[PDB]
């Protein structure tokens, strides 16, 4: 292996840059990173400048780690505040403390001295995520395979370039002139990157992206998969890639990682109970997680010999990213927005549109229609409060379909506040179908929220919220109807517990059904919102329907236009996707017309050349 | 697979009439073929096969079981007894694709007999089916070398037809339908045409040309996922014989392609001529050689000629029909019928929508067309060219005169104008020297009279005493005269020897008879560059023999297409040419149209 020889060259380079007294054992490419192993980690914990002075002269991302838990936990517990938990990752120990300042750098220095492990102290989450813990245990149980997969991915990233050609192009494999099954191929002569691989949203659930075409098969030709955010319509078929023999990395933000596992296991579990087609088994979710490499916002990451990736805040859901790809030594820069919201919301900061360079933007277009404004945050809230207030005060209960992550959380923040300020009546807000576990995960990723929510996490711990995922518990809400609010899955009524709630509450006109975001073509929710009163399960709906389209987590028409208009630098092309046909085409020609930027709607199975 | 062929056999045997038997059933290329020891019975009742074909939706030919076929040498002797000595048979060729023997006779009626009597007696005795043809005036050495090569390789040939055949008749496997076109070269440029037409079941490559311009080594983007692995390619279609459309077809074989190449019969012959010449000249001049001659052989073993108007299943869901393009001998417009009427797309290749000295106008009538992919060489708003009659008078008046030309294309139309001019006395007289395979190319025209228009057909000009071929001792000997010489845009060949020596005397003229592409020496000169060689030598442009539709003609072609297409796409022109023509069709004719870009894929359905 002539890659060993570039790692030796790197070892020796490093060794003559190191200060006296500091040694390393080995140097390895592990995923995106160059990793230095050391028998003296304390020395790197004390002087953070070595890694600075090292990365500097090497022009790359470098981590150090200890040369290779139950005795560590015990040695730490003597040496060290009210510690909730520990997690031994990279030779780090995460410590959860109610008072984190008391554990931190004199004392952190003394702790590393005695135990070697590097302490990362974190404030004890108000809520326990059972998913975060299961993933951590699963990663420990699979450390050997994981290290080996990182080595393989690493060496492939640092293979040498072999074409004397330069070009860049994007092929669409789903998510064009439709909402659903987003999946795109960015390719160069050296590299093929897959952005997203979603499930369909609409009439037919089985429909996948066009994965069987020469541009994607054989899957081993794929350098990486990027997941822009955790929504099923963007990650849901990533495990199918593995089923079909993909063996590279999946890159996403840390919260995406956690949500993706949650939503995936739930997808296939619900699919079994409801009796639909099950695209992959749970073993493929495990395989996807073993190949997942999280990256934080703003962390520039070599994912291929000629491609650097940087994630930025998208403002859509927890961990949602805008994906910037820097190709070559400044050959081209392309941004895939994923789903985004160019506006500060209760949970997140606005989508980012400042980049060192951007020649091409591929943007979503969900509210892309000329018509498609959505009410201001403040007005949407008052509207929700009034619909819910009125429903309760007259003895009805308010069913609000939602996704586990996305529309549910913003709705909860509004409700808790409203009840707290005596603006909706004190009444139980039931939460069904993984909403609550999804919310727990937010607590574990404070850095992915905006400043105000960060300081607050406390809304989500209100007495009002009552979770339910027991089926036995569901029936008690049903058998004793009693004025309340129900957030329940799934967000477009194509299935899930919201259908049980609906099957039983749709008859009394006193009740209300609250749509808080768009409902896509072909969905049950969409069909209801069009004033169909006969819904197949066949039972007739007399219940009030209100639409308070303020919590979708997407940029409205104005915001889509402002995002591109105010982008720095200004891009030379934009392409549109993730909207119904008219939405993509309307937004595209609007941007050409108003902003004079050449823009056009993508079509599934077309390939466009960027350079 | 044998088992599905038995199921066909046993099936056909159930419906054959009493007395009629078959031995074997094979897919050979696009056809299902029934072998029989009693061919006479199929010659008498044509209703047997014609019905079976229409029943199974597929072309069917019957052929004699080899066990009832005489050897060629005994067939030659049996024919020579049976036929009158003054029939004067020049040659024989025993086609192994069809169990037919082509007999070339000076007097063809004598070999056929009174009402076919003698042709009947010959088949009776030799099994082979005689197709008699009038002996071509010029002798094509290429045509003869190809025929001999096919005989020497009969076993591999039959086996390649079997393999290609079984692949064509594989069953469909997708529940999806779509069509799309990927461009791999020839977009916003002249040169290295190569397009991929694809469906969920099929991938078809149309053309695979060499570059024309500054850099000769430049190929189409053949190394991308849509083309590798090359076994995924069902078929290669070669629209016409020009190097900028077929010249790298043998590179495909070098890189492991093993399916068919489909083109017209004259294209086949011209392609082999021009390819062997390409690599031979590249050796002598000292440029990069992309493949060896062995790859031209391999290509020819895989070539399957189709005549115009022959509807041909090339894939489980694609039927192909060639039609006259009007550009050069054998040039085709390619119509692809996808599915059971899912979509129809025409690739025009290079074409000319006007009757010329040699050819009829490009065809633009089809049963259906939803998409047209058209050339755009003279696509600029500016790019009219003079009338045939006016072009001729101009050439006559201008006309030592060096005229760069391609082996096939510009050279032949020029030759017809010159011989006539000299004969009538428009230019008094001169030896018209012909260098670099022009003459051999012209011989090939004589072998394909059906691919010419009516008037030239009746005429076969080319045997005038004036024309003097030359291909190194002759070169050196070259006194007032005319020189047609290769290559047509001055990127190399003997015309550079002629030029290296005649460029100094201002007395001499350099005649450009067709466009010169970006990056060529001819283009540089044609722009009035005088430098390196000092270039005081008259330059005249008589742009009337390119063999392409001018701007008016391009527009007329689409404007009168029946049916009207829903989209057109443009290619094969310099950037401004492709974009200009596109938006001109959108504006004038209201048909959505746009120029293609290399490496983009467009979805048709
Ligand atoms: Zn989303
Ligand atoms: Zn989405
Ligand atoms: Zn041509
Ligand atoms: Zn051409």
């Amino acid at each position: 292996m002539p890659i060993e020889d570039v790692l030796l060259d790197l070892k020796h380079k490093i060794e003559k840059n190191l200060p006296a007294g500091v040694t390393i054992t080995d140097v390895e490419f592990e995923g995106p990173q160059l990793v230095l192993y050391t028998e003296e980690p304390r020395k790197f914990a004390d002087d953070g400048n070595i890694i600075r002075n090292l990365a500097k002269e090497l022009r790359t991302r470098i981590a150090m780690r200890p040369d290779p838990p139950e005795d560590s936990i015990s040695i730490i517990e003597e040496v060290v505040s009210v510690i909730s938990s520990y997690y031994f990752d990279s030779g780090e120990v995460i410590i959860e403390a109610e008072k984190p300042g008391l554990v931190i750098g004199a004392t952190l220095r003394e702790i590393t001295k005695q135990i070697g492990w590097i302490p990362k102290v974190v404030r004890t989450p108000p809520i326990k995520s059972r998913t975060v813990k299961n993933i951590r245990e699963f990663m420990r149980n699979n450390l050997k395979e994981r290290k080996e997969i990182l080595k393989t991915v690493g060496r492939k990233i640092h293979r040498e370039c072999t074409s004397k050609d330069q070009w860049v192009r994007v092929t669409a494999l789903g998510g064009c002139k439709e909402v659903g099954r987003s999946c795109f191929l960015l390719s160069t002569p050296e590299s093929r990157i897959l952005i997203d691989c979603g499930v369909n949203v609409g009439s037919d659930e089985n429909m996948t992206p066009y994965l069987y075409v020469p541009e994607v098969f054989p899957l081993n030709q794929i350098d990486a998969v990027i997941v822009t955010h955790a929504h099923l319509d963007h990650q849901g078929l990533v495990p199918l890639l593995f089923k079909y023999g993909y063996e590279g990395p999946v890159y996403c933000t840390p919260p995406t990682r956690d949500l993706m596992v949650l939503l995936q296991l739930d997808y296939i579990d619900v699919a079994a109970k409801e009796g639909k087609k099950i695209p992959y088994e749970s073993g493929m979710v495990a395989k996807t997680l073993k190949h997942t490499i999280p990256l934080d916002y703003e962390e520039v990451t070599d994912i291929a010999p000629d491609i650097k990736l940087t994630f930025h805040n998208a403002g859509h859901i927890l961990g949602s990213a805008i994906s910037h790809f820097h190709i070559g030594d400044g050959l081209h820069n392309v941004v895939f927005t994923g789903d985004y919201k160019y506006e500060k919301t209760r949970l997140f900061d606005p989508a980012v549109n400042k980049f060192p360079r951007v020649e091409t933007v591929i943007s979503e277009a969900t509210y892309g229609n000329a018509n498609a404004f959505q009410p201001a945050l403040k007005d949407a809230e008052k509207h929700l409060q009034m619909v819910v207030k009125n429903t309760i005060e007259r003895g009805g209960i308010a069913v609000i379909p939602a996704f586990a992550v996305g529309r549910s959380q913003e709705v909860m923040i509004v409700l808790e506040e409203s009840i707290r300020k005596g603006l909706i009546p004190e009444v139980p807000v039931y939460l069904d179908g993984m909403i609550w576990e999804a919310t727990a995960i937010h607590a574990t990723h404070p850095e992915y929220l905006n400043n105000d929510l960060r300081k607050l996490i406390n809304p989500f711990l209100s007495e009002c919220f009552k979770p339910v995922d027991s089926h036995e518990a569901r029936q008690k809400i049903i058998q004793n109807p009693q004025p309340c609010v129900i957030l329940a899955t799934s967000g477009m009524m194509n299935g899930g517990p919201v259908m049980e709630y609906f099957k039983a509450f749709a008859e009394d006109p006193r009740n209300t059904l609250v749509f808080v975001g768009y409902q896509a073509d072909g969905t049950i929710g969409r069909r209801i919102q069009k004033g169909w009163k006969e819904i197949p399960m066949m039972l007739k709906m007399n219940m009030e329907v209100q639409v308070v389209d303020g919590f979708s987590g997407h940029s409205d028409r104005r915001q889509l236009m402002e995002y591109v208009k105010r982008m720095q630098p200004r891009p030379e092309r934009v392409f549109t996707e993730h909207g119904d046909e008219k939405a993509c085409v309307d937004l595209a020609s609007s941007v050409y017309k108003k902003l004079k930027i050449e823009t056009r709607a993508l079509t599934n199975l077309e390939t466009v050349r960027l350079l």
Side-chain angles (χ1 to χ4, degrees), chain A residues 2-4 6-41 43-51 53-55 57-58 60-69 81-98 100-106 116-127 129 131-139 141-143 145-276 278-280 282-353 355-377 379-381 383-454 456-502 504-507 509 511-592 595 597-611:
Chain A
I3 192 84
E4 276 191 286
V6 315
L7 287 173
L8 257 74
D9 195 295
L10 285 171
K11 178 154 144 70
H12 295 145
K13 254 268 178 74
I14 276 144
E15 299 215 307
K16 56 193 58 156
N17 255 358
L18 287 175
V22 179
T23 59
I24 57 174
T25 52
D26 270 64
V27 152
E28 279 288 341
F29 294 125
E30 298 178 4
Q33 300 187 116
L34 179 51
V35 166
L36 317 185
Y37 286 99
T38 194
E39 294 178 303
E40 314 187 277
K43 300 184 178 203
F44 287 80
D46 292 311
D47 205 356
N49 293 343
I50 298 163
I51 306 299
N53 269 170
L54 258 33
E57 201 72 353
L58 275 175
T60 160
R61 299 229 332 277
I62 302 193
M64 84 78 183
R65 29 190 301 211
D67 197 86
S81 312
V82 194
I83 296 159
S84 153
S85 90
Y86 306 82
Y87 165 59
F88 293 81
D89 190 343
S90 60
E92 301 187 345
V93 53
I94 302 289
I95 288 178
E96 282 181 16
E98 210 156 281
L102 298 175
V103 44
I104 298 189
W117 292 95
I118 311 153
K120 309 305 198 177
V121 183
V122 132
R123 205 193 200 290
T124 295
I127 330 176
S129 177
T131 317
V132 164
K133 149 180 141 76
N134 281 309
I135 289 172
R136 287 166 178 195
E137 266 180 319
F138 172 91
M139 295 283 88
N141 278 327
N142 288 294
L143 204 218
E145 197 181 24
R146 172 64 166 189
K147 183 185 169 189
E148 193 59 67
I149 293 157
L150 289 189
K151 280 190 230 160
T152 296
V153 167
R155 296 181 212 242
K156 173 141 162 191
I157 292 175
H158 300 85
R159 72 182 181 280
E160 288 179 6
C161 277
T162 48
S163 192
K164 194 29 174 155
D165 286 344
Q166 37 209 17
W167 44 257
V168 190
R169 50 190 199 145
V170 176
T171 303
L173 301 168
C176 293
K177 292 178 171 70
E178 63 195 2
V179 168
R181 56 163 191 183
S182 284
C183 184
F184 292 87
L185 190 74
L186 167 63
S187 80
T188 80
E190 316 280 349
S191 304
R192 286 145 299 269
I193 304 309
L194 215 55
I195 296 96
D196 288 342
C197 194
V199 296
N200 206 35
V201 169
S203 261
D204 188 312
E205 304 275 34
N206 316 148
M207 227 173 256
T208 69
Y210 297 91
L211 296 177
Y212 308 83
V213 293
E215 298 82 308
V216 151
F217 271 61
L219 294 163
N220 71 16
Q221 89 181 261
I222 310 289
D223 293 52
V225 172
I226 282 81
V227 175
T228 59
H229 65 289
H231 280 149
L232 271 163
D233 66 302
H234 299 258
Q235 52 80 1
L237 286 176
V238 167
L240 190 55
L241 296 176
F242 287 96
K243 184 175 172 149
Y244 291 155
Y246 181 60
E247 258 165 5
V250 178
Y251 293 103
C252 65
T253 56
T256 296
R257 205 254 301 256
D258 294 346
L259 293 162
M260 166 165 76
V261 162
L262 184 65
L263 295 176
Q264 285 177 359
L265 291 172
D266 185 56
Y267 173 51
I268 70 189
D269 184 64
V270 168
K273 307 301 161 43
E274 297 200 327
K276 297 166 187 185
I278 312 185
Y280 46 81
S282 59
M284 291 302 109
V285 179
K287 195 164 198 315
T288 298
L289 177 60
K290 279 189 274 210
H291 291 73
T292 305
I293 307 167
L295 311 180
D296 289 289
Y297 296 152
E298 293 192 5
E299 180 166 71
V300 184
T301 304
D302 305 310
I303 60 177
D306 59 349
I307 307 182
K308 283 186 191 46
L309 166 65
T310 324
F311 288 136
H312 301 260
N313 182 73
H316 174 62
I317 62 170
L318 184 63
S320 67
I322 282 169
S323 299
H324 180 274
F325 294 92
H326 177 48
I327 314 216
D329 242 36
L331 285 183
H332 199 86
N333 296 260
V334 44
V335 167
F336 280 78
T337 61
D339 293 355
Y340 65 96
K341 188 147 177 80
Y342 193 42
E343 183 196 352
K344 204 234 210 155
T345 59
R346 300 305 290 272
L347 286 172
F348 310 118
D349 297 297
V352 158
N353 65 353
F355 316 98
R357 273 192 36 196
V358 214
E359 283 76 35
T360 303
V361 180
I362 287 128
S363 176
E364 65 143 302
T366 312
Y367 287 73
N369 268 293
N371 208 173
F373 308 102
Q374 69 200 216
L377 137 140
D379 292 340
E381 292 182 2
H383 194 172
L384 190 54
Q385 289 170 321
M386 287 293 173
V387 168
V388 171
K389 187 208 216 182
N390 293 333
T391 296
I392 291 320
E393 273 190 57
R394 86 207 192 218
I397 73 208
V399 172
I400 314 199
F403 294 95
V405 56
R407 302 166 176 196
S408 58
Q409 285 83 29
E410 260 222 280
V411 175
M412 295 164 61
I413 285 162
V414 164
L415 292 165
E416 104 88 40
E417 188 167 58
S418 314
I419 296 202
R420 186 164 54 76
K421 296 155 78 215
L423 223 54
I424 298 173
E426 322 205 306
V427 91
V429 179
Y430 301 97
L431 304 184
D432 200 353
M434 311 297 250
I435 288 173
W436 182 243
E437 180 53 51
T439 302
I441 290 145
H442 289 56
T444 278
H445 300 278
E447 258 79 316
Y448 285 87
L449 308 167
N450 67 42
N451 276 38
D452 292 330
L453 231 221
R454 206 159 127 275
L456 263 319
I457 74 166
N458 179 321
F460 301 133
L461 288 194
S462 178
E463 216 222 22
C464 75
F465 300 123
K466 313 297 191 300
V468 15
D469 292 291
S470 164
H471 156 263
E472 307 277 73
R474 191 162 309 114
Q475 294 291 298
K476 177 171 175 51
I477 292 155
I478 291 178
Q479 255 76 306
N480 301 317
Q482 189 154 52
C484 61
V485 167
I486 306 187
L487 271 28
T489 247
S490 47
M492 299 182 170
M493 299 176 87
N494 259 6
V498 77
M499 291 306 89
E500 256 152 305
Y501 293 111
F502 167 90
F505 294 140
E507 247 68 333
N511 295 326
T512 305
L513 180 71
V514 189
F515 289 114
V516 300
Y518 81 102
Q519 312 284 310
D521 287 351
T523 57
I524 289 305
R526 176 54 153 150
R527 159 126 73 169
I528 293 171
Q529 166 168 294
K530 288 192 226 187
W532 256 278
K533 327 306 274 79
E534 196 90 34
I535 291 72
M537 284 258 302
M538 274 300 213
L539 279 173
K540 261 192 311 314
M541 180 205 173
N542 305 7
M543 88 182 116
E544 186 174 292
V545 171
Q546 289 258 1
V547 178
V548 183
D549 192 2
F551 311 81
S552 66
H554 294 275
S555 288
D556 77 353
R557 160 79 171 203
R558 202 192 87 255
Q559 284 155 0
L560 290 166
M561 287 280 268
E562 289 171 332
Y563 186 78
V564 189
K565 181 165 194 164
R566 264 104 84 151
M567 197 168 285
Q568 288 171 243
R570 188 180 220 50
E572 307 176 341
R573 331 266 271 300
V574 354
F575 290 95
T576 60
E577 46 98 31
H578 197 284
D580 62 41
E581 191 175 19
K582 198 199 189 345
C584 294
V585 171
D586 200 325
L587 185 64
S589 57
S590 292
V591 175
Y592 219 141
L595 305 168
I597 299 165
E598 187 178 291
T599 114
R600 164 157 70 71
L602 297 178
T603 288
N604 290 338
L605 298 175
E606 299 211 317
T607 303
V608 158
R609 189 171 173 179
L610 275 42
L611 190 233

